[PDB]
């Protein structure tokens, strides 16, 4: 009886190691996208860095790439847990997954 | 875990304490059912003709 518990216990650490599972994928796949957005603005930036160059266009460029990284950063939500954009008033937050 | 809503759970456990209250007082067979009794004194026992 009490190994079925465990059992049971088990089964329920499976299903919280599958959510978890799902939230850092969908963290991870937010978090590459403004990897590869913050790359393109280094490589704007780099390239406008020649003063022959207008810096106007590129400052708009930067201004829509950082607000799609903000948009990326605020709708990488799973369940609300999004583990991005968090508090750090109290100086630091710590995400637990069921092992 | 955090991310698990915890308010269905509780009306979960709510139905669930129900059913418990529900097992320990409808298991009676002639009025002593062997649950449920009164701890005031703390020492209760019942026997059976051996």
Request: no cysteine; proline share 0%; aromatic share 4%.
């Amino acid at each position: 009886t009490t190994m079925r518990s465990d059992n049971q216990a088990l089964s329920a650490v499976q299903d919280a190691l599958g959510l978890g599972a799902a939230k850092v994928d969908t963290a991870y796949s937010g978090m590459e996208s403004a990897i590869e957005v913050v790359k393109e603005i280094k490589a704007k930036l780099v390239a406008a860095t020649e003063d022959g160059v207008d810096k106007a266009k590129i400052q708009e460029e930067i201004t829509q790439l950082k607000d799609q990284l903000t948009s990326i950063a605020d709708a990488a939500s799973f369940s609300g847990e999004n583990w991005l954009q968090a508090d750090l008033s109290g100086g630091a937050v710590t995400k637990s997954v069921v092992g």
